[PDB]
Paper text:
CTP synthase (CTPS) catalyzes the final, rate-limiting step of de novo CTP biosynthesis (Lieberman, 1956). Each CTPS monomer consists of a glutaminase domain and an amido-ligase domain connected by an alpha helical linker. Budding yeast have two CTPS isoforms, Ura7 and Ura8, which share 78 % identical residues.
We determined structures of CTPS filament bundles formed at pH 6.0 to better understand the mechanisms of lateral assembly. Reference-free two-dimensional averages of bundle segments from cryo-EM images of Ura7 and Ura8 were strikingly regular, suggesting ordered assembly contacts. This high degree of order allowed us to determine three-dimensional structures of both homologs in the presence of substrates or product using a single particle reconstruction approach by focused refinement of interacting pairs of filaments. The Ura8 substrate-bound structure had the same architecture as both Ura7 bundles, but the product-bound Ura8 structure had very different interfaces between filaments, giving rise to filaments in register. Domain rotations and the state of the closed ammonia channel were nearly identical between filaments and bundles. Unlike single Ura8 filaments determined at an intermediate pH (6.5) and with two rotamers for His360, the bundle map appeared to fit a single rotamer which points to D370. In the substrate-bound structure, Leu277 nestles into a hydrophobic pocket formed by Ile383/Ile387/Ile412/Phe429.
Residue numbers in the entry:
A (entry chain A), B (entry chain F), C (entry chain E): 1 to 443, 456 to 571
The structure:
């Protein structure tokens, strides 16, 4: 087992998550089996309790774990499945040793942060890195650890102490440290004192960096490389840079151009790892596929515009799996994507009195779009604006996908306007008044990977053809509210077909509307099962439908 | 409310606990109401799970809290009652904020060590210092906080960060810092660089010391004072020393000789605290009583020897409340005390084969003693040796006190040798063989302050006369095993009278033997209710009985 | 005497020098007498030995001290005269205590960085701040100390230790700390962890900041202020920002808008300083003059273009007094300035073979300009290019000023082309060949403030009219080479009049050419005597001449 810590810097926004995911995928090009662990200094047990306004969305695993967003970067670059154990936190590990001290496994000893908590962290990392995470039976060859927060924040102290010990409690040449660090530019001169201070803060904790990975708005000067490589122990080829490029898929090839594998191939002795003839082929094949999708982003120009309608769209981190799911679906179509970020509340007619500027801009953006997405996220702000987007998309025949809350919004819209029930509404917020036209109801969560069964007549639907006309689908759920199953037959008779349901019925999971080119919704989040070469099927439907060629996509999928 | 932090140094053994207790009692000489809080960086919720081989005994509060030993130093110097809340720990406060984050009181925010855990520590200190701790109704004027561990140990980090904030979240002139620090002597020269480094480690965390309290084997030189007072912000009178004197009761008067009150009277503005005419009298009266008991230790010479028989007596911290209870009882008698530390196992005849030196020395020490104590502490090592000490004390008519296990050992001894049941024994360790002559049985703990009722005939006993012939007694329990109540009438008929029991009966709490000058035992720990001017009654009995004058002590108590 | 330390941050490029100069001038608006001290962690005794390619130009004082560039910012904002003592360095103070230890003033004691070097720094600051620096007789009321380098660089250690002591060796309310710090913006979010780390690094040395002065590309958010004011001891009004505005003259009014005086007026108790009725008037008058010159930069639009021709013009810090002298002269004319930065070598015909792009651009820039400046700076690169600019300016009748080397270049040009001596040249670089047509000769430096006497016939010259037709001028020299006084009568007969000379003659200091609107040169640096309200006279000539209205400027000066 090899370990690669990706760590620290001078700021919390530095973009470690891209570099960790990219470093792991580059190791996967050698054919190595790879896994990864995110460490969070926060005291929350999970990202589930904490609101999307901080650290972006929670990400859902097959376990039903509501983990930190960074686990999604690993799953979509590395192709692996992660467990709720792969997101370590301060909350998890203090809860673990405190529950263990009350149970008494420490034999009446005094329990202390060193050695007992730092040995508990090292036991967690040793257990969790040996969980098999590919579909194959094998234990991973390499583990990427991403150390969240910044080095020398008091929040991090047990993890920087544990990782010092770990560099010896596992062999050297089985452990290596990448430090990620800020190189700000002032008056056009590339200033280095922030990264020199961060390299000292690592040495103060006994962590010694094997590569320094600069984050900068420029190519590093050869003087900027030398002034760091002379201050730190790293050689000139071990001062990595990652530029402020928009395409995060280019980062693996920007690291490969900087010869970063050729250092880790020595520094971790990756030639001593045994590999089969299948492994080297499936490794090199994966690199050629990534050269092709990045070539397609360099030379595809013909924009498809998708409008994304939701709360707090200024927090673009709040929708990162949607963004990445749309980008995978646009690459599969060989088309460039624009996302138009529509703050759903500004669509509402009250905005035309309160701030007439925001009203006209938000309705410009929505009218402009070749297809529409309503992305999910609980909370009562802007839902009539999201209902207005679903209405516009139904009436103007514009491709629509509704994910989680977006499906319920389309059901409420179709009830208010096509069934003509003018006060039909979500149970989430009006039930203090005990309303009879319930569109949502409660059914304390439904979470993680679940089976959807396609209902027997559904063979016609564009969405069931996108799932290869298979009878069942596996996707990740997260909801407490679902469509009222008393009203379902009214919608299924008026043409809004609930194409798929849970095994028990009375719990709707996919709809497609008869008489529209692509108007679809899902109760699950299709984003989380997206992979770079195999996009999320409902999103491959939406981004093909917006472009045209949805028939040719379905004809392809029938091979 | 005023706060006085006592803190840190270069080593964990430095003796903060004496200085905190002494500083608080000196503030009590002004008539101020005083309280105190111990902070422990360990992850244990309580000292109850952890074995006496580390940090000495657990101390029992009236709550039944098995707290850190340092709470006992506060109760016996300050005269206060502490709650299980007055011992803060890493385990307590991480358990508190983690349970609070799962309950969700933090409104979906990300929870972090700063500000959320440091604000939870500051809320704990603010709540707990306002608990009334004297017998009177009033809230305390001053709180002493003792910061356990050492400054810049990673274990301490949330508490040194919290206390920086606290210096502002409560006013300056309502908070002050005492730093306690090591001044080692090499070649007879008093070296200062360890304390200069500890003063820098405080400044690095933003904590600024108002007094530096040196711990040294000498009087500080005036150069040793100046070389510290020139390096640090403290004036010459704010460099305190506490010498390696044996009598810890002299420390309050050694601080008073160094004019330490006259600094805090300015630095905390203690003249602005309102005080009544009763308060100043009961304050100054308390100082004169302490001048008298310390004068008596300077001029009493006529030694009483008590042998203390138990496990691990090399760990003299394991019996600190016994030691202090014996010292209070010897001072009340105006007699000097020697304790003879007898490792109970060495009394056993197997020792005479294994190491004949340890056998003869341990039996020398036991034969030498004017009275005998068997102190408690669970675990099967040496119990036949403790039975042999109880036998010797019964047969030779030598004063005996058995506390907790020491009472059960005397019951087992009296059963084996006076009732003549040769295999009668503790249920604690032989019950894998299901023995019928059970002396102990289980009755998951009995803990904290409980009532003992004296059984109706008991008026004759020296122990009930020592409790003023009152019908009931309040003392602190800690046990899972008690005397088999089926066998009690056999002992009460053979003369081993169970003088006191729980309200329900079938649970024995005090015995006295008919036909011995003072042979007594208690199921409770009488040590924990000892106070400097009012010693523990069973121990005032033992140390009077060893000296003679037990009648005159009882005649006094009848006033 | 009051002290205001301006300090530190995360980077060496942060712009402390503007903030120190601006803070001092704002204190001068109260009428206080002000002075300032620059501390440099470098080991050079002076900036004289070190080449202009690092830390910009050396600045010349009236003493002849070749000081750090930052002393010029103080002289031109504060209006004061500085001595070579006002630039403290590591080289100066270690040379001082080492020479003092060899002389033995330390009475055979062991000499150490603390207390002896830190007390030597504190003695330097106490001596030097009491030097009178205005033209009046008074000792300064306030001293601004600028701490060069960054805090926690090992280079700085004696100065951060000395300044901790100084906060007590002078009273609190007579000392205050401004910390200047970087607030980088990433994804449009204003990240604060670099400044939180810099505030900890101050506390680690015992320096406590009274204001935090952010340097950022934006207005701080009110959340960005609160997240710093909650972490540090500073109040919300003590988190200062200085924006990336181009006009450094706006910074005093941006600090005044942030109410920064109203904090220091309390925190330094500046109302306790006695002030006369003249002082408050000359103080408030100075503020109104600064409101006017800044209003003129807001509403003047009619550009004058000056081409500056020299070595290494990419290092714009290399010519900072030229830049500021041109800006003062353009403000006095009520006209906006563009400087066109012409790398002098690119003008040379060899460039048209080597890189034809750089040739055409440099000759575009020179042809475009309303006036030309040749700025000084020793070294043989580009001098024929500077000769070509002097030729172009003479022949096309375009206003020309030559400063130091720029005068000698114009003398060489006039000799090569108007006297027709085709190989006449500088002695600086050809004298290995012992050439007879010497234009320069050596006359080991001439340095500091010196008298120029105007030669008797010179009453006609635009340059002597710009100096008010006074018979003598006081300006700062710096040169080893001067015009060959054997050839001077040839130039004075051909019309290139050496209008001014040293008292001894044979040493030429000003020329003006008969028969050109303004073609002038100086051996001294006129830049260094520029002040915001009273620009350098040769530069007020150049920037008026380029604009037209040179007659009206001279008519004004005759009042
Ligand atoms: N080298 C990079 N190139 C492009 N974008 C980057 C880069 N580094 C960081 N980012 C971007 O900055 C944001 C944060 O990056 P990332 O998640 O990898 O940082 P992080 O250190 O893991 O932050 P966090 O601790 O909050 O998870 C993301 O939007 C990411 O795409
Ligand atoms: N000034 C002193 N004079 C005499 N004995 C002292 C002194 N300081 C410490 N000691 C002794 O050293 C031991 C530890 O002292 P104390 O309990 O006060 O230290 P502490 O800092 O509180 O240690 P801990 O953190 O383990 O509780 C005790 O036996 C105590 O009596
Ligand atoms: N607030 C600011 N607004 C505009 N420019 C600034 C500001 N702060 C710094 N600069 C610019 O950055 C450069 C360096 O600034 P300054 O000389 O004041 O920094 P410094 O800390 O004194 O650097 P050094 O230590 O090298 O002297 C100069 O060009 C200056 O004009
Ligand atoms: O204003 C001043 C005065 C003095 N000094 C002095 O500090 C020294 C250290 O040099 P810097 O502090 O400029 O650091 P650096 O260039 O090595 O690092 P970067 O942050 O640019 O990567 C020398 O340059 C010396 O003149 C300053 O840096 N700035
Ligand atoms: O062996 C050596 C050589 C050099 N030095 C040098 O270090 C210096 C600092 O002096 P010290 O290190 O002796 O420190 P100090 O006496 O101030 O502090 P204490 O620890 O005794 O309280 C000077 O004494 C200088 O000679 C040593 O201290 N020891
Ligand atoms: O990637 C991760 C994982 C965990 N953490 C964790 O570290 C914590 C500290 O939060 P930050 O490190 O983001 O710091 P901050 O926002 O207070 O400071 P700025 O630098 O933005 O001014 C919490 O946010 C917790 O989730 C991260 O910061 N990043
Ligand atoms: Mg943040
Ligand atoms: Mg991340
Ligand atoms: Mg220990
Ligand atoms: Mg203690
Ligand atoms: Mg530099
Ligand atoms: Mg400067």
């Amino acid at each position: 087992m090899k370990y690669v810590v990706v760590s620290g810097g001078v700021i919390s926004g530095i973009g470690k998550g891209v570099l960790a995911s990219s470093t792991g995928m580059l190791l996967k090009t050698l054919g190595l089996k790879v896994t990864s662990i995110k460490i969070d200094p926060y005291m929350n047990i999970d990202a589930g309790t904490m609101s999307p306004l901080e650290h972006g969305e929670c990400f859902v695993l097959d376990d039903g774990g509501e983990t930190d967003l960074d686990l999604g970067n690993y799953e979509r670059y590395l192709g692996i499945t992660l467990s709720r154990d792969h997101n370590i936190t301060t909350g998890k590990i203090y809860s673990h040793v405190i529950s263990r001290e009350r149970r008494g496994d420490y034999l009446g000893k005094t329990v202390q942060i060193v050695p007992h908590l730092t040995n508990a962290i090292q036991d967690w990392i040793q257990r969790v890195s040996k969980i098999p995470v590919d579909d194959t039976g094998l234990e991973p060859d390499v583990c990427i650890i991403e150390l969240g927060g910044t080095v020398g924040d008091i929040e991090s102290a047990p993890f920087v102490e544990a990782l010092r010990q770990f560099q010896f409690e596992v062999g050297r040449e089985n452990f290596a440290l990448i430090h990620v660090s800020l190189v700000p530019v002032i008056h056009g001169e590339q200033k280095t004192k922030p990264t020199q201070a961060a390299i000292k803060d690592l040495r103060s904790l006994g962590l010694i960096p094997d590569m320094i990975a600069c984050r900068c708005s420029e190519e590093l000067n050869r003087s900027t490389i030398d002034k760091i490589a002379m201050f730190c122990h790293v050689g000139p080829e071990q001062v990595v840079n990652v530029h402020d490029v928009n395409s995060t898929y280019h980062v693996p090839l920007l690291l490969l151009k900087q010869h970063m594998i050729d250092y880790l191939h020595s520094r971790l002795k990756l030639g001593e790892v045994p590999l089969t003839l299948e492994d080297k082929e499936r490794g090199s094949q994966l690199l050629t596929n990534w050269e092709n999708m990045t070539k397609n982003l360099d030379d595809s120009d013909d924009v498809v515009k998708i409008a994304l309608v939701g709360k707090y769209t200024n927090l673009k981190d709040s929708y990162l799996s949607v963004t990445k799911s749309l980008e995978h679906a646009s690459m599969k179509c060989r088309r460039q994507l624009e996302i138009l970020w529509v703050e759903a509340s500004n669509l509402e007619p009250e905005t035309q009195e309160v701030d007439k500027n925001k009203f006209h801009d938000s309705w410009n953006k929505l009218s402009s779009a070749d297809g529409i997405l309503v992305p999910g996220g609980f909370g009562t702000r802007g839902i009539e604006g999201m209902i207005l987007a679903a209405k516009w998309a139904r009436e103007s025949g514009v491709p629509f996908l509704g994910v989680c809350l977006g499906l319920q919004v389309a059901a409420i819209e179709f009830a208010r306007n096509v069934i003509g029930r003018p006060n039909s509404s979500s149970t989430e917020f009006l039930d203090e008044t005990l309303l009879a036209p319930e569109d949502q109801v409660v059914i304390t969560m439904r979470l993680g990977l679940r089976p959807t069964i396609f209902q027997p007549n559904s063979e016609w639907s564009n969405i069931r053809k996108l799932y290869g006309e298979v009878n069942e689908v596996h996707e990740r759920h997260r909801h407490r509210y679902e469509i009222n199953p008393k009203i379902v037959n009214d919608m299924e008779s008026r043409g809004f077909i609930f194409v798929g349901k849970d095994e028990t019925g009375q719990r709707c999971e996919i709809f497609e509307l008869k008489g529209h080119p692509y108007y679809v919704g899902t109760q699950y989040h299709p984003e989380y099962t997206s992979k770079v070469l195999e996009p999320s099927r409902p999103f491959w439907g939406l981004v093909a439908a917006a472009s045209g060629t949805l028939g040719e996509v379905i004809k392809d999928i029938n091979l």
